[PDB]
Protein backbone atom coordinates (compact mmCIF):
# COMPACT_ATOMS: atom_id res chain seq x y z
CA UNK A 1 0.00 0.00 0.00
CA UNK A 2 1.32 3.46 -0.96
CA UNK A 3 -0.02 6.76 0.37
CA UNK A 4 0.59 9.84 -1.79
CA UNK A 5 -0.24 13.01 0.11
CA UNK A 6 -0.93 15.80 -2.36
CA UNK A 7 -1.61 19.51 -2.10
CA UNK A 8 -3.49 22.31 -3.84
CA UNK A 9 -2.07 23.09 -7.25
CA UNK A 10 -0.69 26.58 -7.86
CA UNK A 11 -0.26 27.40 -11.50
CA UNK A 12 -0.22 23.63 -12.00
CA UNK A 13 2.45 22.90 -9.40
CA UNK A 14 1.76 20.62 -6.48
CA UNK A 15 3.62 18.72 -3.81
CA UNK A 16 3.56 14.94 -3.37
CA UNK A 17 4.78 13.22 -0.19
CA UNK A 18 5.07 9.42 -0.33
CA UNK A 19 4.26 7.29 2.70
CA UNK A 20 4.60 10.17 5.15
CA UNK A 21 8.37 10.40 4.88
CA UNK A 22 11.11 11.62 2.52
CA UNK A 23 11.21 8.50 0.34
CA UNK A 24 11.32 9.37 -3.33
CA UNK A 25 14.42 9.16 -5.50
CA UNK A 26 14.89 11.53 -8.48
CA UNK A 27 14.05 8.68 -10.93
CA UNK A 28 10.95 7.74 -8.96
CA UNK A 29 9.88 11.38 -8.82
CA UNK A 30 9.73 11.66 -12.60
CA UNK A 31 7.72 8.45 -12.80
CA UNK A 32 5.37 9.56 -10.06
CA UNK A 33 4.67 12.88 -11.78
CA UNK A 34 4.09 10.97 -15.02
CA UNK A 35 1.35 8.99 -13.24
CA UNK A 36 -0.43 12.34 -12.63
CA UNK A 37 0.06 13.25 -16.33
CA UNK A 38 2.56 15.74 -14.95
CA UNK A 39 6.24 16.52 -15.08
CA UNK A 40 8.88 17.75 -12.60
CA UNK A 41 8.40 21.54 -12.53
CA UNK A 42 11.04 23.77 -13.97
CA UNK A 43 12.42 26.44 -11.63
CA UNK A 44 10.42 29.03 -13.64
CA UNK A 45 7.21 27.02 -13.19
CA UNK A 46 7.95 26.75 -9.47
CA UNK A 47 8.61 30.47 -9.13
CA UNK A 48 5.29 31.27 -10.78
CA UNK A 49 3.53 28.80 -8.45
CA UNK A 50 5.17 30.52 -5.45
CA UNK A 51 3.91 33.87 -6.71
CA UNK A 52 0.34 32.47 -6.76
CA UNK A 53 0.49 31.38 -3.11
CA UNK A 54 2.40 28.07 -3.03
CA UNK A 55 4.57 27.21 -0.08
CA UNK A 56 5.45 24.00 1.70
CA UNK A 57 7.75 23.01 4.55
CA UNK A 58 9.24 19.99 2.76
CA UNK A 59 12.12 19.37 0.40
CA UNK A 60 11.04 18.12 -3.00
CA UNK A 61 12.47 17.59 -6.46
CA UNK A 62 11.96 19.97 -9.30
CA UNK A 63 13.93 19.72 -12.57
CA UNK A 64 17.57 20.14 -11.62
CA UNK A 65 17.27 20.83 -7.90
CA UNK A 66 15.61 19.97 -4.58
CA UNK A 67 13.68 22.93 -3.22
CA UNK A 68 11.19 24.32 -0.72
CA UNK A 69 8.94 27.18 -1.92
CA UNK A 70 8.50 29.69 0.90
CA UNK A 71 6.31 32.75 1.16
CA UNK A 72 6.27 33.34 4.91
CA UNK A 73 9.52 33.08 6.88
CA UNK A 74 9.41 30.22 9.34
CA UNK A 75 12.50 29.25 11.36
CA UNK A 76 11.77 25.51 10.89
CA UNK A 77 11.08 25.72 7.12
CA UNK A 78 14.13 26.31 4.92
CA UNK A 79 16.13 28.10 7.66
CA UNK A 80 13.71 31.12 7.67
CA UNK A 81 14.21 31.79 3.95
CA UNK A 82 11.66 33.08 1.47
CA UNK A 83 11.43 32.40 -2.25
CA UNK A 84 12.25 29.10 -3.87
CA UNK A 85 14.80 27.84 -1.37
CA UNK A 86 17.34 25.59 -3.00
CA UNK A 87 18.90 22.72 -1.03
CA UNK A 88 22.65 23.08 -1.39
CA UNK A 89 24.30 20.53 0.88
CA UNK A 90 22.89 17.18 1.80
CA UNK A 91 24.33 13.70 2.22
CA UNK A 92 21.14 12.00 1.11
CA UNK A 93 19.13 11.36 -2.03
CA UNK A 94 15.47 10.82 -1.10
CA UNK A 95 12.96 13.64 -0.82
CA UNK A 96 9.35 14.40 -1.63
CA UNK A 97 8.53 15.67 -5.14
CA UNK A 98 6.84 18.50 -6.83
CA UNK A 99 4.84 17.89 -10.01
CA UNK A 100 3.48 20.20 -12.68
CA UNK A 101 0.20 19.60 -14.47
CA UNK A 102 -0.08 21.95 -17.48
CA UNK A 103 -3.87 21.42 -17.66
CA UNK A 104 -4.51 22.59 -14.09
CA UNK A 105 -5.94 26.09 -13.44
CA UNK A 106 -3.59 29.06 -13.79
CA UNK A 107 -3.71 30.23 -10.18
CA UNK A 108 -4.68 28.63 -6.83
CA UNK A 109 -6.56 25.38 -7.24
CA UNK A 110 -7.38 24.00 -3.81
CA UNK A 111 -9.87 21.45 -5.05
CA UNK A 112 -8.96 17.88 -4.20
CA UNK A 113 -7.19 15.40 -6.47
CA UNK A 114 -9.58 12.61 -7.43
CA UNK A 115 -7.59 10.50 -9.93
CA UNK A 116 -4.15 9.00 -10.70
CA UNK A 117 -4.82 8.96 -14.42
CA UNK A 118 -1.65 7.50 -15.85
CA UNK A 119 -0.69 4.76 -13.45
CA UNK A 120 0.14 1.35 -14.96
CA UNK A 121 -1.25 -2.07 -14.16
CA UNK A 122 -0.05 -3.39 -10.80
CA UNK A 123 -1.20 -5.16 -7.62
CA UNK A 124 -0.47 -2.47 -5.02
CA UNK A 125 -3.08 -0.07 -3.77
CA UNK A 126 -2.04 3.50 -4.32
CA UNK A 127 -4.03 5.99 -2.27
CA UNK A 128 -4.05 9.71 -3.07
CA UNK A 129 -4.58 11.52 0.21
CA UNK A 130 -5.75 15.09 0.04
CA UNK A 131 -5.04 17.65 2.74
CA UNK A 132 -8.76 17.59 3.61
CA UNK A 133 -8.44 13.83 4.12
CA UNK A 134 -10.44 12.83 1.06
CA UNK A 135 -8.96 9.84 -0.71
CA UNK A 136 -8.83 8.23 -4.12
CA UNK A 137 -7.47 4.67 -4.29
CA UNK A 138 -6.52 2.56 -7.26
CA UNK A 139 -4.50 -0.60 -7.77
CA UNK A 140 -1.47 0.07 -9.96
CA UNK A 141 2.18 0.88 -10.33
CA UNK A 142 4.10 3.91 -11.59
CA UNK A 143 7.77 3.00 -11.09
CA UNK A 144 9.74 2.18 -14.22
CA UNK A 145 13.25 2.04 -12.70
CA UNK A 146 14.41 -1.25 -11.24
CA UNK A 147 16.61 0.64 -8.75
CA UNK A 148 13.39 2.06 -7.14
CA UNK A 149 11.63 -1.34 -7.13
C1 LIG B 1 6.07 0.21 -0.13
S1 LIG B 1 7.45 1.15 -0.83
O1 LIG B 1 8.61 1.05 0.10
O2 LIG B 1 7.18 2.58 -0.88
C2 LIG B 1 7.90 0.50 -2.45
C3 LIG B 1 6.79 0.77 -3.45
N1 LIG B 1 6.56 1.93 -4.07
C4 LIG B 1 5.49 1.76 -4.89
C5 LIG B 1 4.83 2.61 -5.80
C6 LIG B 1 3.71 2.15 -6.49
C7 LIG B 1 3.24 0.85 -6.32
C8 LIG B 1 3.92 0.00 -5.46
C9 LIG B 1 5.06 0.48 -4.74
N2 LIG B 1 5.87 -0.12 -3.83
UniProtKB/Swiss-Prot annotation:
Tissue expression per record: Expressed in the intestinal epithelium.
UniProt-annotated location(s): Cell membrane; Cell projection, Microvillus; Secreted
Link domain location: 12-101
Disulphide-bridged cysteine pairs: 8-110, 33-99, 57-77
Glycan attachment points: 5, 37, 80, 91, 101
Post-translational modification: N-glycosylated.
Binding residue positions for hyaluronan: 21, 58-59, 85
Role according to the record: Cell-surface receptor that plays a role in cell-cell interactions, cell adhesion and migration, helping them to sense and respond to changes in the tissue microenvironment. Participates thereby in a wide variety of cellular functions including the activation, recirculation and homing of T-lymphocytes, hematopoiesis, inflammation and response to bacterial infection.
Domain notes: The lectin-like LINK domain is responsible for hyaluronan binding.
Subunit structure: Interacts with PKN2. Interacts with TIAM1 and TIAM2. Interacts with HA, as well as other glycosaminoglycans, collagen, laminin, and fibronectin via its N-terminal segment. Interacts with UNC119. Interacts with PDPN (via extracellular domain); this interaction is required for PDPN-mediated directional migration and regulation of lamellipodia extension/stabilization during cell spreading and migration. Interacts with RDX, EZR and MSN (via FERM domain). Interacts with EGFR. Interacts with CD74; this complex is essential for the MIF-induced signaling cascade that results in B cell survival.
Protein name: CD44 antigen
GN (gene name): Cd44
Amino acid sequence: QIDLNVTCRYAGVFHVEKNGRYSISRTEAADLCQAFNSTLPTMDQMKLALSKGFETCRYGFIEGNVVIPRIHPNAICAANHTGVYILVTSNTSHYDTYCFNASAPPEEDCTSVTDLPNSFDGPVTITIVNRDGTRYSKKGEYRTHQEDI
